[PDB]
Design a protein around this ligand. Structure first.
Ligand SMILES: [Zn+2]
Lengths: 162, 195, 165, 36, 48, 138, 69, 56, 31, 54
RNA sequence: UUUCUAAUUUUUAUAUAUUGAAGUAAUAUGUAUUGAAUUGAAUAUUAAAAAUACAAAUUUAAUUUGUAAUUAAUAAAUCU
């Protein structure tokens, strides 16, 4: 069938076979507008105001850039990863040289609107400003392929971020 | 009761105060889905309506983080858990819903040729979700305050749910005074499109 | 990898609500042999005067009469097919129910109303959730066999334990 | 194909359309009669 | 017990103000750090 | 680019010109009272040689058989002939000077029918007394 | 926050004498009144880790004279 | 058919002690006088080095 | 005259005059 | 002079870095670091036409 | 598309500036502390101490000097 016996929601694994489930292309389509806002608990978080498909390598290159522009001892970046992953070039004639093994391996997320990505969470009484915050994320936002805006602590008040 | 035929939803007295649509709040009786409710009676957020709980129940305060707050359900609270439910039923209905359209769009700018009216959102609220409101509360975005909605694809616009202060309703909904109704304008030829 | 056959159409061969002869297949159900294994549960279980064919799970009525689907009050996914034998009993009411509601004199809280059944049961039996949710102790489910010989209980039924309402 | 924009006069004479329909359905919600 | 839509519901056609370049400081505060809209490629929204 | 061709009473219009406020004022008139003198003034409107019945009863047809009040020739309107607007062809011209009344079985329907009137541009009606107009037999 | 430990103690009785040789207007020895001058040297101390006793601690300087009351 | 509709008001429409914080960093228009601020010309503030050093 | 008119009440129906403003061949088979 | 792709990216790096209307294009011109910190908004060439650059 | 005629859908639709705000003054916990060859608001990290307002810079091997001192500048008023 289709999703069950998940591997902790990263990707679904076939019930009668440990193979990955190999879903449809437009499964889990991000082209909703997510109704549920995110209750971020970091001081600032980077939510995705639009939708798209973002790799893990695009999200890891962004962390390596956010982790440069951030004061070390004070704030510890927090990157969320519980979201579900999705496959790539999977099909057989649709792969190159019958190497379906080396094309599906990439795992990209289908982010809807308003999913938090990172967190400049605090480890002290040190504080942040939106100017002090957007300045950090302005490095990584140039890698995350979709549009994203930073949001302050607590419930994103999506009346304003949009 | 049978393993085949199970109640699709069951009655529930909430002890805690869950945010989600299936959620409730302190002490109201709600028929929430079975699978969800069954991981509440284990979780402790809910308890099946025994005759005892129908008078009082020890609800929860995040202040001391334990089931101390006794919320007695006299006929007065049962006039409070109604207006507070009837309110956040309009909330969780428009916020969960994704109201569709079919419109005509000759031209290139992907522009709906007869753009939308705040009449034409309360009309697709009452049509699809039966949510009956005043179209004087629907505030549009800044891009569509001038020309109406006017563009295909996903538009959203804010619906103002005014009367939520004597219900003591905050932190159990995303925004006390608004809600994002989420349009979508699926262009269609004269066959299925109106206006 | 392989091929596949086309999924046949397993749908109604009458109009629900309208009269019905016995030689009509009321519904040709998927004997949902998941893939030709031997265990399935049909969508529309048989009802009054309707008898299910064992092999292909197709419901054939047993007596000519008007037909209807009774969605279970507990779970609206599990339906029966009722055939009530008297065709005049419903026609001579429909012709009224649809003549009254034309003059605006019929009430919409009728049991047969589709959207009211959720509330209808609750006006009469207010705790029916608890009457089906109640779990029975294995003592009362097998009432004292001596009460059967002493004749107190008319006849012990130990397997009929599930409330199908 | 839909290449150049709908001329403005057309959009305007199509805003008269929805304001025709918005004037039909004002007729199709009148009472069936009038107590006179 | 009256709610007037008009108090809180404001539908104002606001002029999107230019980032004032004629003054130096108000050009720097106005620098809304979302000018990295350059990631607006209409990229593949359901594939990679 | 609407609101340039059409007014502001376009797109910013809550076309629900039916009942954003009147329903409230309906429950206002419900509160105060209606009594003998409040019918005795209407009695003078029956004393007025010009006979247009003042009060109207929106009650089920079996109810009125039980307590017939039709004596002063008052109007018996089904509460939908009021709501639907089928009654405007028999309704006073002076929308600002006329105050009819509305009798009803239980006072929820009365106010629920008088709000329909105030939706039809009517200004004064205190909207109920099932028992007074019988105690004021006239 | 750089070092993890309060360094050498002090007591307000001592800052009042560091504050006596530190007068901004050495023409007007007390332009800032002395008590106002101390909160300055106290803050500069705390900013160096100098936890003084009268504050920063649960108990003030214990005395063999009398009850805490 | 169910129709969902708001309850009748018993208290103030816009919440006051229930208001969610605004949601945008509340750097007021007066701490960084970015725009929308109007001041009398007699009462011009904060020119401590330009034209408040010689106040009138 | 400030009075709900009093008299034996006749009710009168309505008669719609319908015209066709859009071509029929653009629309569905039900319309 | 690196065309700062939108107008909004323009930033005055130096004290002598100011704005200028170089033929309808808002640009940044600095006497110091003359081309090192110079920025020019993206816009049509100063002398375009209606058939060549739309 | 019988023929003469009449007609309500038109290779005509509105494009972002006014203002290189650059004079107006010695100082004073203080060159904090730490890490540092050195660092004095502008190395590195560290940032909720204060009082008698000006610690996210340029500058210098360091400082001082020297730039800088949170302001009027309403395109909205459709143009037909
Ligand atoms: Zn420069």
């Amino acid at each position: 069938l289709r999703p069950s016996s998940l591997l902790r929601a990263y990707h679904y694994v076939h019930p009668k076979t440990g193979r990955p489930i190999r879903q449809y292309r437009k499964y889990g389509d991000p082209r909703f507008i997510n109704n549920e806002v995110a209750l971020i608990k970091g001081l600032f978080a980077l939510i995705t105001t639009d939708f798209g498909m973002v790799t893990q390598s695009q999200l890891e290159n962004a962390r390596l850039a956010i982790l440069r522009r951030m004061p070390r001892g004070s704030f510890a970046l927090t990157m969320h990863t519980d979201y579900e992953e999705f496959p790539v070039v999977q099909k057989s004639p649709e792969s190159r040289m019958g190497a379906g093994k080396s094309n599906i391996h990439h795992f990209a997320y289908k982010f809807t609107t308003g999913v938090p990505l990172f967190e400049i969470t605090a480890l002290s009484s040190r504080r942040l400003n939106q100017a002090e915050a957007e300045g950090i994320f302005l490095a990584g936002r140039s890698f995350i392929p979709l549009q994203t805006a930073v949001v302050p602590r607590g419930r994103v008040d999506e009346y304003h971020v949009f | 009761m049978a393993p085949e035929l199970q109640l699709e939803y069951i009655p529930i007295i909430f002890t805690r105060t869950i945010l989600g649509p299936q959620g409730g709040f302190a002490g109201e009786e709600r028929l929430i889905k079975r699978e969800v409710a069954q991981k509440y009676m284990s979780e402790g957020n809910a308890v099946t309506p025994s005759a005892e709980f129908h008078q009082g129940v020890w609800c929860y305060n995040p202040d001391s983080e334990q089931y101390d707050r006794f919320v007695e359900r006299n006929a007065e609270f049962l006039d409070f858990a109604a207006r507070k439910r009837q309110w956040l039923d309009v909330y969780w209905r428009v916020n969960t819903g994704y109201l569709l359209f079919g419109r005509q769009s000759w031209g290139q700018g992907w522009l709906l040729n007869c753009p939308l009216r705040k009449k034409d959102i309360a009309q697709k609220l009452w049509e699809q979700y039966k949510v009956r409101v005043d179209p004087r509360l629907i505030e549009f975005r800044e891009k569509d305050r001038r020309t109406g909605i006017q563009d295909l694809g996903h538009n959203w616009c804010w619906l103002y749910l005014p009367g939520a202060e004597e219900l003591a309703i905050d932190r159990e909904v995303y925004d006390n005074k608004r809600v994002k109704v989420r349009m979508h304008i699926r262009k269609m030829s004269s066959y299925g499109a109106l206006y | 990898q392989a091929g596949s056959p086309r999924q046949k159409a397993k749908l109604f061969h009458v109009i629900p609500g309208t009269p019905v002869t016995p030689v009509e297949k009321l519904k040709e159900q998927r004997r949902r042999f998941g893939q030709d294994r031997y265990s399935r549960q049909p969508e529309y279980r048989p009802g009054r005067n309707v008898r299910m064919d064992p092999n292909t799970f197709t419901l054939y009525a047993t007596t000519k009469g008007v037909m209807t689907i009774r969605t279970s009050r507990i779970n609206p996914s599990y339906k029966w097919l009722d055939v009530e034998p008297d065709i005049q009993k419903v026609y001579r009411s429909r012709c009224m129910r649809a003549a009254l509601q034309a003059r605006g004199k019929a009430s919409m809280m009728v049991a047969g109303n589709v959207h009211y059944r959720a509330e209808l049961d609750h006006v009469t039996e207010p705790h029916w959730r608890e009457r089906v949710m109640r779990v029975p102790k294995a003592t009362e489910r097998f009432q004292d066999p001596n009460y059967f010989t002493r004749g107190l209980v008319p006849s012990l039924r130990p397997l009929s334990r599930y409330s199908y309402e | 194909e839909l290449l150049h924009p709908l001329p403005v006069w057309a959009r305007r004479q199509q805003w008269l359309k929805r304001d025709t329909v918005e004037m039909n359905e004002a007729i199709l919600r009148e009472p069936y009669y009038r107590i006179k | 017990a009256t709610y007037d839509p008009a108090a809180f519901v404001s539908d104002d056609i606001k002029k999107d103000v230019r980032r004032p370049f004629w003054s130096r400081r108000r050009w720097a505060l106005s620098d809304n750090f979302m000018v990295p809209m350059s990631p607006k490629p209409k990229n593949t929204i359901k594939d990679e | 680019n609407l609101n340039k061709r059409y007014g502001a009473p376009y797109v910013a219009k809550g076309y629900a010109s039916l009942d954003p406020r009147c329903s409230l004022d309906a429950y206002s008139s419900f509160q105060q009272t209606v009594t003998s003198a409040d019918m005795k003034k209407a009695l003078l409107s029956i004393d007025s040689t010009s006979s247009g019945a003042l009060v109207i009863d929106v009650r089920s047809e079996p109810e009125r058989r039980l307590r017939p009040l039709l004596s002063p020739a008052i109007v018996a309107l089904h509460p939908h002939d009021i709501l639907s607007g089928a009654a405007c062809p028999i309704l006073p011209s002076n929308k600002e000077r006329a105050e009819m009344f509305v009798v009803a079985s239980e006072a929820q329907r009365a106010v629920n029918a008088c709000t329909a009137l105030r939706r039809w541009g009517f200004s004064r009606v205190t909207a109920v007394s099932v028992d007074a107009v019988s105690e004021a037999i006239a | 926050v750089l070092r993890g430990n309060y360094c050498a103690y002090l007591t307000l009785e001592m800052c009042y004498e560091i504050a006596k040789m530190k007068q901004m207007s050495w023409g007007k020895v007390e332009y800032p009144p002395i008590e106002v001058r101390v909160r300055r040297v106290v803050g500069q101390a705390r900013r160096m880790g100098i936890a003084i006793i009268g504050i920063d601690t649960v108990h003030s300087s214990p005395v063999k004279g009398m009850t805490e009351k | 058919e169910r129709y969902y509709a708001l309850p009748h008001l018993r208290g103030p429409s816009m919440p006051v002690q229930l208001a969610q914080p605004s949601g945008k960093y509340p750097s007021g228009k007066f701490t960084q006088m970015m725009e929308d601020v109007a001041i009398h010309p007699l009462q011009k503030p904060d020119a401590r080095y330009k034209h408040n050093m010689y106040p009138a | 005259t400030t009075t709900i008119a009093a008299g034996p009440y006749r009710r009168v129906g309505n008669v719609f005059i319908v015209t066709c403003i859009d071509h029929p061949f653009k629309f569905s088979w039900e319309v | 002079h690196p065309g700062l792709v939108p107008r909004d990216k323009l930033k005055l790096h130096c004290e002598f870095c100011r704005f200028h209307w170089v033929q309808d294009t808002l640009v940044v011109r600095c006497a110091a670091h003359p081309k090192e910190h110079n920025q020019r908004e993206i816009w049509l060439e100063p002398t375009w036409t209606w058939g060549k650059q739309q």
